[model samples]
Target: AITDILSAKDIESALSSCQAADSFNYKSFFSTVGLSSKTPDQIKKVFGILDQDKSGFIEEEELQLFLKNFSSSARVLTSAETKAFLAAGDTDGDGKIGVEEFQSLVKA
Candidate 1:
């Protein structure tokens, strides 16, 4: 259930909700997300997967490319759906996503 585009308030709400969730421990959560103790090398490897162009930051095009290739045990969106999502989340009109915007989109 992806939420809507988040405003700052939405981020606050998400932080509160995360705090309230009894099982939500930041370290443990990171571990569960396969990002625990990410070393520089590990970060580079993961970034390489996400960064289609080998750029330091992940851009909207890279994101779209990733989604196009994305597969999971549960249902994943089609390429068209992923494009729509990217459009919705690229709120700055730059056709690229920044870290803060990405987080807001995820929290929404």
Candidate 2:
């Protein structure tokens, strides 16, 4: 377990978003917020967060949102780097991360 974890501002934003929601939308709540759920379940929830369009694929723009919000100390990845990272996970080179690829990455 982590102690002395820095609670970034975006984490608070997600908490507040959870509060503002009419119900507990886990997908609405998950971010870089150190999720509590374990295994494939947690992975799917976070995948939804990155898949903003609900398109079943995480595009570059949505990926950018994730990388930016990942940490305040984190420097933003350029679009090229983002794509390359996605490609690393995208074993089929489909240009976007599908559910299977994401799950494999999660397991890895």
Candidate 3:
């Protein structure tokens, strides 16, 4: 495990400081998760972690538990937040976010 890249501690700390029900916009969401400062490689790593079932894509259910993927103690994303996040990353309208789509989202 690459501890230096978005360390679990960092994720928990960042998430703990934020409001669980806050509306999620890409910029705000990325900022809250410390994604704004991460390079593409690191972003890709994040996608890997989020794709919990290893199906090579982040499905709607995975996106629903998006925050918990980062930290076990985190709250689930609100329904609106999950919908917005899905819209942002599922660029091909396939109802799932592949690694490429996820990378594009983080880079944007």
Compare the candidates by TM-score and give the number of the best one.
Answer: 3
For lDDT, candidate 2 versus 3, the one ahead is 3
Per-prediction CA RMSD (Å): 12.3, 11.0, 2.3
Following a full C-alpha superposition, what root-mean-square deviation does model 2 have from the true structure?
A: 11.0
Q: Which stretches of candidate 2 lie over 4 Å from their true place?
A: 1-37, 69-76
Give lDDT tens digits, candidate 2, residues 1-107.
11123245657565454332133333343433554334666567667666878998987676655544444443344566566567666888867888778777655
Query: Which structure is stronger by TM-score: 2 or 3?
Result: 3
Q: Enumerate residue pairs that collide in model 2.
A: none
Worst 10 residues of 2 by lDDT: 18-27
Q: Write the per-residue lDDT of candidate 3 for residues 3-99, one digit (tens) a residue.
A: 4576666665566665458554556657655776788788778778889898999999888887776667677878888888898888999999998
Q: Which candidate would rank higher by TM-score, 1 or 3?
A: 3
Question: In what order do the candidates fall by lDDT, top score first?
Answer: 3, 2, 1
lDDT score for candidate 1 against the true structure: 0.45
Q: Considering TM-score, where higher is better, how would the candidates rank from best to worst?
A: 3, 2, 1
Off by over 4 Å in 3: 1-3, 7-13
Worst 10 residues of 1 by lDDT: 1-10
Pairs with steric clashes in candidate 1: none
